[PDB]
Design a protein around this ligand. Structure first.
Ligand SMILES: *Cc1c(COP(=O)(O)O)cnc(C)c1O
Ligand SMILES: *Cc1c(COP(=O)(O)O)cnc(C)c1O
Lengths: 388, 388
């Protein structure tokens, strides 16, 4: 009657109560400004939606190879060569249910009981939980607003132990929205290569960039970095396809084949017609992406300016993704208390940094309409003035 | 360099050489009579496809609850009450990527290193591999043509040890097409109940029955069995939705919640619009099912008689699914050899029984048109004659 230890070790969500309160308030018709979303507000581009409907009509509703539709594995490989300078072939990629499964399959393929996985904080909520489902030991590397929430190569080097099996490297970042410069990624890749450790490069937000920030896949830092790294990414953020559940793992054939064995004995191939939508996302014009990015840039401008004019905060300027992760340390309140109080007092929903391993910060998403942002930021400022 | 022990323990497929070759042969102009498919030939019913297209058009493309869409979880619970006499509510349901992920999540939730899992042979190929991915130890129970390829409760009792944690029970069965009668299901249920052993009830083929055979969910055998059993099923076979990847886990709330946590940290929710199609499958008329079933019953009758009139083969009568699993023992050959030459020499595709733990048999699938069946059965007879 006892559950496996691996699942018992998974931590319960820290945002259960605040999420329920927000839900209930909305059910009552209370005017809430929400900045908790972890997905774009845009609809999936029409041509991607149409491709999927066409595949459905064409009968693309049967089983397919576990590694994914050959046409999509090819499109992905070509995209990685063209955009990221990564020399991959179709044999190097595995189609998964979102970037999440890509990461999950990598963990089960590489992490054995006892292995340590270095995870810089703040971190995407699922990272340590996934490491634990694979029976590994999460090694959290804390960062500060003073360091732009970035881990240094020396910080990584110090955390390496004979048990260290993997380094999780997410840029641009959720929840900070911070972007490691190409020189910074090259410097991090250098430490990894020297210590001979594998790197999981989570590049899901690669296209959501601002102020001419530049994205460099860590695997493109050098041929040695390429040999010990895998790309975990997908179509969710670039194309507002969060609900499609289509992503991929790209790396050395040996690893990919092992990850593919796992895919075949867990979920089998990814939804066939959903894969066709992803084919269209890469095979067609990227105009939709730039149009969406432009709206984001406009929202970012507004929220950043507002946040910068508020007392009691410290927000490092983010150049990627669609999040702001300001420090609320000056308020002397923990993230749970701060966000719960802000919601109750001013009806503004934000995510406590505690969920990402940073109790003195909060996450806001500007992936919502400008009017919600303007009104919400006004309420937030008023809240800060009332508690300092 | 070194992959986790869990994935290195997963055996390589010995079927993708045929099931995939027959395809390559078909695509090359060669007239192949394929009886190797593990999915129906029928297209997904129109109303289900339309329901999915409508969802896509309506923007059901965002993240959703890890447990699945509330409407689908409710439609599933109702279906289980109405069809299988199970009293599940929505809280007992977890929407997964096919019945395969339902089984996978269950394994990860309750199977730990050292745990033993009893698996009746011939078994669905993935069962032992999934047990091993959860680091468990499979305990395979051999059956013979004499026992109609069905295990007896005494055989199960004899195999139970203090390390036994689970019994995998699949009926109707893949690859045998055999159906355990309600009395047999009740008998097996009581051995499990007496031992306080949990039962994984793989009921995916529950609707595909013949000669008025009857399907009884193990959990409906008694309140005690209902307490320690779970249903792993889906829409794949009943509605020709194999490529949709929509299935479910149904069981006690505590277990379902644990499986849901794993779902949340592995793949997240199941493709949102694909789920809306599953809703249409259960909410609408079941005429599509009876029609396909009718076409299946006609093909079965023909293949069954053709097989029964073939000396050198012994095939118990299958009353479920769309498979036949005749013994080729008389030929004194291994299924790998037999199936290999049959394809090479007569362009007839069948799956080696060795894949399912029974090298002295072969699986035939009659999920194809009648003309292909009569032609293929004539080629099979000739082949047999040549080696007997
Ligand atoms: C959203 C996200 C992912 C992947 O999500 P999918 O919907 O599974 O593709 C991976 N990493 C980070 C940091 C994310 O925010
Ligand atoms: C087809 C099948 C399943 C379910 O597969 P999905 O497509 O993942 O739902 C489960 N068990 C058996 C024995 C099967 O043949």
């Amino acid at each position: 009657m006892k559950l496996a230890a691996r699942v018992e070790s998974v931590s319960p969500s820290m945002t259960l109560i605040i999420d329920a309160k927000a839900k209930a308030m909305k059910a009552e018709g209370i005017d809430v400004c929400s900045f908790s979303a972890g997905e774009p507000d845009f609809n999936t581009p029409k041509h991607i939606v149409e491709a999927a409907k066409a595949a459905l009509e064409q009968g693309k509703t049967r089983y397919g190879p576990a590694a994914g539709e050959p046409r999509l594995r090819e499109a992905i490989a070509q995209k990685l060569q063209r955009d990221n300078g990564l020399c991959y072939g179709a044999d190097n990629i595995l189609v998964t249910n979102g970037g999440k499964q890509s990461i999950f399959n990598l963990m089960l393929a590489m992490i054995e009981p006892g292995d340590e996985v270095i995870i810089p904080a703040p971190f995407w909520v699922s990272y340590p939980e996934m490491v634990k489902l694979a029976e590994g030991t999460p090694v959290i590397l804390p960062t500060t607003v003073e360091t732009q929430f970035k881990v240094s190569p020396e910080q990584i080097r110090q955390a390496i132990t004979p048990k260290t099996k993997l380094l999780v490297f997410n840029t641009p970042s959720n929840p900070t929205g911070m972007v490691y410069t190409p020189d910074e990624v090259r410097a991090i890749a250098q430490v990894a290569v020297e210590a001979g450790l594998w790197v999981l490069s989570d590049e899901i937000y690669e296209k959501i960039l601002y102020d001419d920030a530049q994205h460099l896949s860590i695997g493109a830092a050098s041929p040695e970095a390429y040999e010990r790294s895998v790309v975990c990414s997908g179509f969710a953020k670039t194309y507002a396809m969060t609900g499609w559940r289509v992503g991929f793992l790209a790396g050395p054939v040996p690893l990919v084949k092992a990850a593919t064995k796992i895919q075949g004995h867990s979920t089998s191939n990814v939804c066939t017609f959903a894969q066709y939508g992803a084919i269209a996302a890469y095979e067609n014009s990227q105009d939709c992406v730039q149009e969406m990015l432009a709206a984001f840039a406009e929202r970012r401008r507004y929220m950043l300016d507002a946040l910068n004019a508020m007392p009691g905060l410290e927000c490092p300027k983010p150049d990627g993704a669609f999040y702001m992760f300001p420090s609320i340390a000056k308020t002397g309140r923990s993230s749970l208390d701060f966000c719960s109080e802000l919601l109750d007092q001013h009806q503004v929903a934000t995510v406590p940094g505690a969920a990402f391993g940073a109790d003195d910060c909060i996450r806001l998403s500007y992936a919502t309409d400008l009017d919600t942002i303007k009104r919400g930021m006004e309420r937030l400022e008023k809240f800060l003035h009332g508690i300092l």
